[PDB]
Amino acid sequence: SGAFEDRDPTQFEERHLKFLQQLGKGSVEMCRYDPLQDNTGEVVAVKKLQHSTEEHLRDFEREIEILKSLQHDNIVKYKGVCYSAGRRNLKLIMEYLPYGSLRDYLQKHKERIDHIKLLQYTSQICKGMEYLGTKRYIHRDLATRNILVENENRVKIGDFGLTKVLPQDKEYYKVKEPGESPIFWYAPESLTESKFSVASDVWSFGVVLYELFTYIEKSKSPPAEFMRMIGNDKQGQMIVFHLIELLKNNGRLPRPDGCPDEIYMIMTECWNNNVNQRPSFRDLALRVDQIRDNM
Numbered sequence: 001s002g003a004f005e006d007r008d009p010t011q012f013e014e015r016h017l018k019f020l021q022q023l024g025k026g027s028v029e030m031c032r033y034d035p036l037q038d039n040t041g042e043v044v045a046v047k048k049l050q051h052s053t054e055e056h057l058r059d060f061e062r063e064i065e066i067l068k069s070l071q072h073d074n075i076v077k078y079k080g081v082c083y084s085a086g087r088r089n090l091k092l093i094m095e096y097l098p099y100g101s102l103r104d105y106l107q108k109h110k111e112r113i114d115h116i117k118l119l120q121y122t123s124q125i126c127k128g129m130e131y132l133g134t135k136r137y138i139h140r141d142l143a144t145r146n147i148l149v150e151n152e153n154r155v156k157i158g159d160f161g162l163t164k165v166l167p168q169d170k171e172y173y174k175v176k177e178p179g180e181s182p183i184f185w186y187a188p189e190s191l192t193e194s195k196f197s198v199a200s201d202v203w204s205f206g207v208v209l210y211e212l213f214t215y216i217e218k219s220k221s222p223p224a225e226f227m228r229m230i231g232n233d234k235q236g237q238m239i240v241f242h243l244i245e246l247l248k249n250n251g252r253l254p255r256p257d258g259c260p261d262e263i264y265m266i267m268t269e270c271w272n273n274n275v276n277q278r279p280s281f282r283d284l285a286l287r288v289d290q291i292r293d294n295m
């Protein structure tokens with residue numbers, strides 16, 4: 001009955017997006033996009049909300065804009081949007097990464113992980129973060145659970161739902177928000193003052209590096225280790241009070257078993273209370289690639 005002109009490959013048609021699997025609960029599904037009706041098509045990941053409140057939808061739209069603005073080998077690829085429920089709902093379309101989160105990959109695929117691989121992932125994470133800096137984006141949620149694995153040789157930063165954009169003349173973003181924070185990845189100034197910056201991303205990167213070198217041994221996770229240092233029985237605000245006091249006076253995650261001193265030195269430089277003395281992501285990428293190249 002109708003003629004058709006497609007001038008926007010970023011608009012995925014609801015009727016052609018076919019369910020493959022539930023990936024985790026926002027919630028993410030794996031789907032097949034099959035406009036040619038032939039039982040094939042590209043496999044994609046689809047992110048949807050739980051509640052489309054004026055607030056959550058505005059945030060979701062901002063996350064979509066953020067992801068769309070990014071094009072880099074070490075950042076999850078934006079593919080498009082689907083305006084489902086007859087154009088009364090919104091879903092984000094992105095590339096599907098077969099190995100899932102780095103946290104899970106390290107846990108489930110120890111057979112294929114050595115220090116060479118760990119430094120390769122470290123390098124790629126720094127380069128993705130360098131790229132975010134050029135956009136003046138502050139991620140605020142760097143952790144191995146939020147980094148995704150394409151294959152043995154490539155990891156990508158995901159999870160842009162907390163990302164903030166710095167105005168031209170500003171060097172930090174103060175954000176007070178209700179609910180739970182990933183406190184064991186937070187820099188001291190984020191804990192005490194809700195201040196986020198490239199330098200606070202560098203602090204969190206230090207924790208990521210720690211996570212890599214612990215191989216996600218369940219007992220060695222940042223929450224497990226900090227809670228052991230703080231006291232395992234502590235609950236609620238008391239945890240935060242003790243974490244802050246600990247960090248302000250140089251309490252730090254321990255060197256993981258089998259971690260070279262030079263790699264631990266990188267973590268400890270990231271974990272500087274003095275914001276301005278933390279290294280840049282460019283400094284880190286160079287140092288890590290030089291370590292890699294010098295063997």
Ligand SMILES: O=C(Nc1nccc2[nH]c(-c3c(Cl)cccc3Cl)nc12)C1CC1
Pocket residue numbers: 023024025028045094095096097098099100101145146147148158159
């Ligand atoms: O889930 C998989 N791959 C994935 N591909 C593409 C995008 C993906 N986003 C996630 C994801 C999930 Cl479900 C929960 C929390 C945090 C993240 Cl970052 N996972 C994604 C593989 C394991 C089946």
